[PDB]
């Protein structure tokens, strides 16, 4: 027996039941829903699906709100064990010829007093110029491409080089995409983003995302995860024929 | 996209989000729910699971409540194409020496004005003395055992013979049984029942179940589908050594 489950489950079932009566959900609709749940499972989309609609709320309960950096969902594409980068400067692992503009990120990690948090490790992950994540696409190796950890200098500053991630489309043809495009008449795009996770002894993990100014999807994120402070100004420069996009961000972590 | 589907989804979504805040669902709890949903599907238990918890409510919306016969859930074990029985009287297909007490069911199919519904077909199915349903158990062949269609006499009366169903246990070991037995600390038993489906041109389908007086789970159906109108008095008598259980019911259909 588990009392937590009993408490919650009965109120959950009561609420869905009232929901079924109040919205007149009939036999054929029910079977549609049922078959839809089955197909989400068959496509392995539950993490994708649940993250898209409910994970922002779970984050809220967990991280609260305040002076520190805002959360954004982890999503389903994180992978533990990303390699530590200590090169100067640190570059995420990528293919020779890795497509996209080049990107340089600088920033810092401090608490709310502005003391540097030397004990932090920062995970980074993002998709290819083509909208795929390593480990999650048949078109990419199951290797740590575009994934890495960096540690702050003792003054708290950090830096990593990579490629510029682009807007990402949840597949139109899977059940998650079919809900977003067809049944809801919306779309299934997210704006371009860099995923960040920062942990440190004495501190609450920060899991967040960084977005880019002028992204067409900033106001219609299909996972509803954009916050204004997380949208980054871009300074575009040329070097040797290659465009570099320079972005910067100061992370503040929450005590505990 | 259909306006109501959209407003239904957005509202469902708000229900869940409020639920998550109001009860403070944590990240690990969220992950537990996620992997459990993944389980139900991998076990092929969505029909079993949703039927257990929500199909009664869906039924109440769809069929309603009046002076016609009460609905009860279809559940996951129905099978199309059962044979027409026309013997004297109709006997459901069963093995030689099929275990359990012999059962004789009698009754009628009428409209609400008392007139017999000659165009009706009644499907019947129920489990064996061992709690097995044919086509859903490796302990039985994939043949129409304890499943059949009967047709009323011109005066609306009906009769078939079978064996007496007994309490049915949802498997303990599966995700549905785990939530029921282990996490909720209850049981996964249903009381003994006979499944009935009646269709007739110009009438709405009746899906219902018949239960038996004195069953120990009439007050604790793991699927919440017992209604006192559908609990049948049993007249038990001996005939040439064998116990017969006699049960009777007058079905009433609503017009289209
Ligand atoms: C409209 C269709 C509805 C579909 C809903 C299906 C979701 C039902 C989830 C059933 C709960 C699973 C219980 C898992 C218990 C377990 O495996 O033990 C592990 C863990 C340690 O034990 C725990 O303490 C985890 C407790 C999780 C809280 C369960 C609350 C169930 C209410 C549904 C909340 C829906 C909001 C996302
Ligand atoms: C933490 C728990 C999360 C549980 C997830 C539940 C899964 C939600 C499933 C929503 C998918 C909607 C089905 C696709 C709709 C569709 O195909 O077009 C509409 C269709 C028209 O003819 P086909 O039929 C319908 O209108 C189906 C009704 C759609 C209602 C969706 C609103 C979700 C409410 C779920 C209530 C739960 C009842 C058991
Ligand atoms: Cl992992
Ligand atoms: Cl700690
Ligand atoms: Cl603080
Ligand atoms: Cl008709
Ligand atoms: Fe992402
Ligand atoms: Fe049954």
From Swiss-Prot, chains A, B:
Cofactor field: Fe(3+)
Keyword tags: Aromatic hydrocarbons catabolism, Dioxygenase, Iron, Metal-binding, Oxidoreductase
Catalytic activity: 4-chlorocatechol + O2 = 3-chloro-cis,cis-muconate + 2 H(+); 3,5-dichlorocatechol + O2 = (2E,4E)-2,4-dichloromuconate + 2 H(+)
Enzyme class: oxidoreductase
Gene Ontology biological-process annotations: catabolic process; catechol-containing compound metabolic process
CDD domains: 1_2-CCD
GO molecular function per UniProt: catechol 1,2-dioxygenase activity; ferric iron binding
Annotated Pfam families: Dioxygenase_C, Dioxygenase_N
InterPro entries in alphabetical order: Catechol_dOase_N, Chlorcchol_dOase, Intradiol_dOase_C, Intradiol_dOase_core, Intradiol_RC_Dioxygenase
Family per record: Belongs to the intradiol ring-cleavage dioxygenase family.
Protein known as: Chlorocatechol 1,2-dioxygenase
Gene that this polypeptide is encoded by: clcA
């Amino acid at each position: 027996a588990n009392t937590r489950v009993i408490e919650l489950f009965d109120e959950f079932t009561d609420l869905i039941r009232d929901f079924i009566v109040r919205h007149e959900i009939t036999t054929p609709e029910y079977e549609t829903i049922m078959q839809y749940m089955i197909s989400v499972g068959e496509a392995g989309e539950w993490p994708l699906w649940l993250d898209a609609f409910f994970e922002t709320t779970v984050d809220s309960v967990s991280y609260g709100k305040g002076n520190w950096t805002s959360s954004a969902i982890q999503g389903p594409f994180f992978k533990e064990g990303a390699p530590l980068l200590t090169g100067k400067p640190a570059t995420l692992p990528m293919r020779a010829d890795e497509p996209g503009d080049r990107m340089r990120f600088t920033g810092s990690v401090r608490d709310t007093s502005g003391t540097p948090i030397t004990g932090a490790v920062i995970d980074v992950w993002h998709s290819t110029n083509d909208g795929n994540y390593s480990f999650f696409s048949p078109a990419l190796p199951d290797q740590y491409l575009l994934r890495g950890r960096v540690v702050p200098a003792e003054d708290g500053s950090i830096e990593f080089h990579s490629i510029r991630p682009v807007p990402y489309e949840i597949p139109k043809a899977g059940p998650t995409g079919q809900l977003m495009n067809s049944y809801l008449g919306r779309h299934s795009w997210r704006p371009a983003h860099i995923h960040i996770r920062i942990t440190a002894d004495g501190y609450r993990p920060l899991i967040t995302q960084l977005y880019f100014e002028g992204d067409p999807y900033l106001d219609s994120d299909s996972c509803s995860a954009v916050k204004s402070e997380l949208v980054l100004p871009v300074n575009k420069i040329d070097i040797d024929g290659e465009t570099w996009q320079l972005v910067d961000f100061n992370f503040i972590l929450q005590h505990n």
